[PDB]
Amino acid sequence: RAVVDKVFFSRLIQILKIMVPRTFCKETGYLVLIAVMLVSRTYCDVWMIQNGTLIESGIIGRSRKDFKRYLLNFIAAMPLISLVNNFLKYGLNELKLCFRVRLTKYLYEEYLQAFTYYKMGNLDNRIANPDQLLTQDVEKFCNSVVDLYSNLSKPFLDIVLYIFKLASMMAYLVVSGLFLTRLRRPIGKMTITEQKYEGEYRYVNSRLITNSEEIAFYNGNKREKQTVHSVFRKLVEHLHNFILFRFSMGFIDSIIAKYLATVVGYLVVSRPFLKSTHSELLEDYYQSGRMLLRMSQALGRIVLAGREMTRLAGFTARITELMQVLKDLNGEIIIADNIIKFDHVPLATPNGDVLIRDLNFEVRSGANVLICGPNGCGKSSLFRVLGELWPLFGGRLTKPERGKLFYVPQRPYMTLGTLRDQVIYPDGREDQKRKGISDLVLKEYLDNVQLGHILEREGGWDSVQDWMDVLSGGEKQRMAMARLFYHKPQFAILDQCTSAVSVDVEGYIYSHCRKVGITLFTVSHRKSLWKHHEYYLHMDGRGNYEFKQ
Amino acid sequence: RAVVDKVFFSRLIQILKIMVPRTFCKETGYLVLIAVMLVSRTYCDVWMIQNGTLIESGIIGRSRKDFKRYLLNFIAAMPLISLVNNFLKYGLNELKLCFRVRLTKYLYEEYLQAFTYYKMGNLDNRIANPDQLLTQDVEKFCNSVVDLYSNLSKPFLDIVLYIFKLASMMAYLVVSGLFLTRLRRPIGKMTITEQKYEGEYRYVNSRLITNSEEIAFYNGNKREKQTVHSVFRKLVEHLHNFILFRFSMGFIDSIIAKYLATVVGYLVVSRPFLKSTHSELLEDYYQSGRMLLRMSQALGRIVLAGREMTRLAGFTARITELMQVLKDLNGEIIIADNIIKFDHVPLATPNGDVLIRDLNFEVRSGANVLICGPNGCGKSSLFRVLGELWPLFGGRLTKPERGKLFYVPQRPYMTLGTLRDQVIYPDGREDQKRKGISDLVLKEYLDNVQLGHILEREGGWDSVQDWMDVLSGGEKQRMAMARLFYHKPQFAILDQCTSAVSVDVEGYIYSHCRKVGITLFTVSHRKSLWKHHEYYLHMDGRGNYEFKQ
Numbered sequence A, B: 001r002a003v004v005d006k007v008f009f010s011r012l013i014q015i016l017k018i019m020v021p022r023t024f025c026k027e028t029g030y031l032v033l034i035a036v037m038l039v040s041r042t043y044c045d046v047w048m049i050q051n052g053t054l055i056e057s058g059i060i061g062r063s064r065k066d067f068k069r070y071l072l073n074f075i076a077a078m079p080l081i082s083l084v085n086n087f088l089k090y091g092l093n094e095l096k097l098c099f100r101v102r103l104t105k106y107l108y109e110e111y112l113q114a115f116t117y118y119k120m121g122n123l124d125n126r127i128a129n130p131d132q133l134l135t136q137d138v139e140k141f142c143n144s145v146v147d148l149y150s151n152l153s154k155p156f157l158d159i160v161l162y163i164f165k166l167a168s169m170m171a172y173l174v175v176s177g178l179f180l181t182r183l184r185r186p187i188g189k190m191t192i193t194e195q196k197y198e199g200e201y202r203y204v205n206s207r208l209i210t211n212s213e214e215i216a217f218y219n220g221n222k223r224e225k226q227t228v229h230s231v232f233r234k235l236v237e238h239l240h241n242f243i244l245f246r247f248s249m250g251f252i253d254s255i256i257a258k259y260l261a262t263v264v265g266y267l268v269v270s271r272p273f274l275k276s277t278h279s280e281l282l283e284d285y286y287q288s289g290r291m292l293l294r295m296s297q298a299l300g301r302i303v304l305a306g307r308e309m310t311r312l313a314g315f316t317a318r319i320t321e322l323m324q325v326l327k328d329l330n331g332e333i334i335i336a337d338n339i340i341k342f343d344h345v346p347l348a349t350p351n352g353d354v355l356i357r358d359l360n361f362e363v364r365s366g367a368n369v370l371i372c373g374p375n376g377c378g379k380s381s382l383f384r385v386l387g388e389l390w391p392l393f394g395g396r397l398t399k400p401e402r403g404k405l406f407y408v409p410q411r412p413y414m415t416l417g418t419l420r421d422q423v424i425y426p427d428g429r430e431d432q433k434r435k436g437i438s439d440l441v442l443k444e445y446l447d448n449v450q451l452g453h454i455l456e457r458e459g460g461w462d463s464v465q466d467w468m469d470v471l472s473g474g475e476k477q478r479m480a481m482a483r484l485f486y487h488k489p490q491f492a493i494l495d496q497c498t499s500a501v502s503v504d505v506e507g508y509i510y511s512h513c514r515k516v517g518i519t520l521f522t523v524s525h526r527k528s529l530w531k532h533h534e535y536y537l538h539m540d541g542r543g544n545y546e547f548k549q
């Protein structure tokens, strides 16, 4: 699940392809910039030592100009040195930000393209809490993928650069890579579960905040505290195992990489010190052996920084799993114009179970339909099948496209934004007038909001600082009623518009509905709205339905 | 405001005390362990450089035996000298985890103690997205606070333990910390706003996930994509200025801290080399001024690591606001026993508006009350005032208690967990039998769930893998009806029981309700449930009521 091998590299290439898509794109200039201002640094660090070993020597004898004037160059190279360092830093962080932007854009365009933000979750249980796998996991993956750059690549143009100056068979990375890896697999395995627990904790908090009024009424403070501490203590308890494992890792990661590296370096550098027969004043080692031990230290630092690789396997496994949002692919629907038909389609829940297995009926744009029954017999699930929310697993089905068809769900929804956008949820604001017909929001909508909605002076046409769906009350489902009269659909399908009002304004909405060519298809548990309806289509929990007039 | 000054230190102390309660706690020993394993680690380098200079001095000659016997000591010390480093590493992040645990526990016990998880937000708008400020902000703050240790403390004692061997007037921190800070102020406010934008982005994603079905029915994929990409681009556009400021800061921060420090060290160390009269073979500089330039490097590194201080100003200035949940302190309430009184109490919304100002009614244990009226006239807001959800605002009222009372909110709520816990939401499971009367879940609760709930075989008494409030349907509000009969309160204040079956189950619930002595206080828009009710108390949108029979 986090093993570093061929499959991991393939699963990393398949996600790197979508980022830096082309040649010399907007962000491919950072793979070159941090490939030129980074090598310039590793030529500027040997120069740091070279001036370092030639400055103190200057101030040894009674020489002032050999240090005063000599030191000046260092002060002259300080601006360039710092500029190179910070240019590398900026290139790195800008590259990670651009990587994140591209990955997020791809994931979103692939994640809201259809009824897939709904299927992930309520329909399919394969990924838990997707609101964190593409908001916090993407950021961490972008941060880590670049940090495997500049580390395992920064001490890479330091072995070759030192090799430029230079029998050295000290390729002990062969035995310190096969070892010191495959011993760090638990880090990759359990970074995934740490992320999972963090996501669950955050989701519990968010759910508590969301329905913070129902919980308040029930006085469930103690129960909610218990059920949150249950998942918090399930997190830190695991972090203790994770944190204590990194200690057991550093012990072997600091006696085979950071310290034993210098031991082998000393062992190899001093092989020809028992040709250079005499090398009278044999301080040449300071310019040919010191560099060798520095190279050995960098070679050890390579594998030492290889730690970030396995900690990235978990992130890659998590995100590459989120790229099973290709369920966009994994009976038939006929695109009719005026008649909604149901040819022996057994409606069913997402799992395997049939509520009503006949559903042999149809409607036309001349007879408002009202359907009733007990609570829990494929009533609100009929629309989910008619709409592309649930599968069909049946015969034929016809509907008037999707533009000339409106749905009001069983539960209210007020989008976040301005009041105007509440009347127009789907289209938006620019489409409201520019792309489509120009509706005078100043005046044309007050008639569309003639449902007794006095909440127009209550905030003005553009009120968002004090707006939400926790403020309207029970009239936020008749605010959805003032959405048909703007969308003017050929067919309107209403799921429990009741609970708005008994008689004061319930009749007004329906009277206006068939004062326009809006054929109605409603569910309601009432006897005071049958006057403006024609057909019956009554169904019960016995698996059979009665279609009458 | 994230300026590093007296107020910041005061605010850091006031929240440091809550994670160091007593002397030698479960984590107060980590301030000792990482204080002796850290000073025992600065004995590694000093021992490393001394030995490091020792070996090759033994290989300048051809003494194989000397080098061998004087290298084995390094092999022997490798285990201890790596164990010390890794023990510092473990004691470091274990301390941050403990800090996080204590801070989270305090914040939660202070945040779920009353109806404050509700007041924060719906009632008060002072903190936005409280679900991220105690889930992600706390973790980052704990990580940062310790990282100001081992950095500004790791090099702190590398200055006193180098002074152990030593005219050192190079105290230029006075001019390099007064400068180079107050020139980094933007980082604090800018990390604060970055955290704000990240929280808003995550909240938008969570809100999209929560009511995904409603969004799917409206076909609002395009609108939701637009409103998400609007706040994502509002974030990365700011991270661009953030990482374009760090480089603009790193430039100045790497020519006054990391390289000019070396220049000043070379300048000061050279003063005597111009009273060491002759010191023939002046190699003593390798141990009498090399340490001096190392000390200057560490002194520069102190101010360089001072960067984490200002980046920690933002987190502290953020969390200190979340510790304004002291609104728990921010008319009259009388604990009567059997009368829900209302003496000239003007019910009002959280803001400064009044809906009805008389409210001079009362009820008794033998008079069920059903109230109605238009939609949007303090109907469901009467309970929010009767219950301690909204301010009393004046007048007087008396209620029996909070234990022998019940509220069914207008919107349904099924807590996450098992099916059994759905019936017992507030009390939980342990209290279901131990702290209170023992109810036989296998048999006793079937009669308590005699409301037509056929979901006895549907998952079993303990089903959580396939449970949620997005699965029940219209029966998740009458599952709250099969939750009043278990609490058996004095009065049952239920709200919008409608959308349950009109006749099949509506009559059964109310007939059973008055069989047991639970006086019903209900709001509904119906005529089929008025038979089992006594008093009108009709409500209107003109601030008046009747209270007839």
Ligand SMILES: Nc1ncnc2c1ncn2[C@@H]1O[C@H](COP(=O)(O)OP(=O)(O)OP(=O)(O)O)[C@@H](O)[C@H]1O
Pocket (backbone or CB within 6 Å): A122, A349, A350, A351, A355, A374, A375, A376, A377, A378, A379, A380, A381, A382, A410, A496, B470, B471, B472, B473, B474, B475, B499
């Ligand atoms: N996600 C789901 N998976 C499986 N079964 C579900 C799911 N959601 C609901 N159900 C069950 O499937 C059937 C759906 O009933 P349904 O929601 O359609 O009608 P209705 O909505 O019951 O009428 P009402 O709105 O009044 O409750 C019921 O058996 C319901 O309990």
Ligand SMILES: Nc1ncnc2c1ncn2[C@@H]1O[C@H](COP(=O)(O)OP(=O)(O)OP(=O)(O)O)[C@@H](O)[C@H]1O
Pocket (backbone or CB within 6 Å): A470, A471, A472, A473, A474, A475, A499, A500, B122, B349, B350, B351, B355, B374, B375, B376, B377, B378, B379, B380, B381, B382, B410
């Ligand atoms: N948080 C809030 N702040 C200010 N006003 C609110 C808030 N919530 C609701 N309101 C408004 O306050 C009044 C309370 O209405 P209320 O919720 O009481 O309607 P209702 O009585 O619940 O009727 P119903 O349940 O059918 O709507 C209404 O004016 C409502 O629009």
